[PDB]
């Protein structure tokens, strides 16, 4: 599914990231929005032949296990596979343990150059 920004601005609220780790929900609604373009099958393959993978574009490199990134972790030990639901309960919790990892948010590229910097609640602005 393609979400509406505050549609999942409420759904994420619903799933505790309103202020998760430090960081308001204006954060995570940018790093979806430039992520996955609220997409929630989204998928983008990676240079090293890793995947980024769903609303949250999370990378089969590190997070999850895609049976074909040679280098695997699975550290939020879920298939990648998992993370293309229309129900986004499996990505918020693999991104908790992203955030917690001990680097902010800064994994998430898109979120890192494009949200990190900006007023950010204008992405819940109106909700």
Not at 21 to 48: H, I, M, P
Not at 61 to 75: I, K, V, Y
Not at 111 to 121: E, H, L
């Amino acid at each position: 599914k393609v979400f509406g920004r505050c549609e999942l601005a409420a759904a994420m609220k619903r799933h505790g990231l309103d202020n998760y780790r430090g960081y308001s929900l204006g954060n995570w609604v940018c790093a979806a929005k430039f992520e996955s373009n609220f997409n929630t099958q989204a998928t983008n393959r990676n240079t090293d032949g890793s995947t980024d993978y769903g609303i949250l574009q999370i990378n089969s490199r590190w997070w999850c296990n895609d049976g074909r990134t040679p280098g695997s972790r699975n550290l939020c030990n879920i298939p990648c596979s998992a993370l293309l639901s229309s129900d986004i309960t499996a990505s918020v919790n693999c991104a908790k343990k992203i955030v917690s990892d001990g680097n902010g948010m800064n994994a998430w590229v898109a979120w890192r150059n494009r949200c990190k910097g900006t007023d950010v609640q204008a992405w819940i602005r109106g909700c």
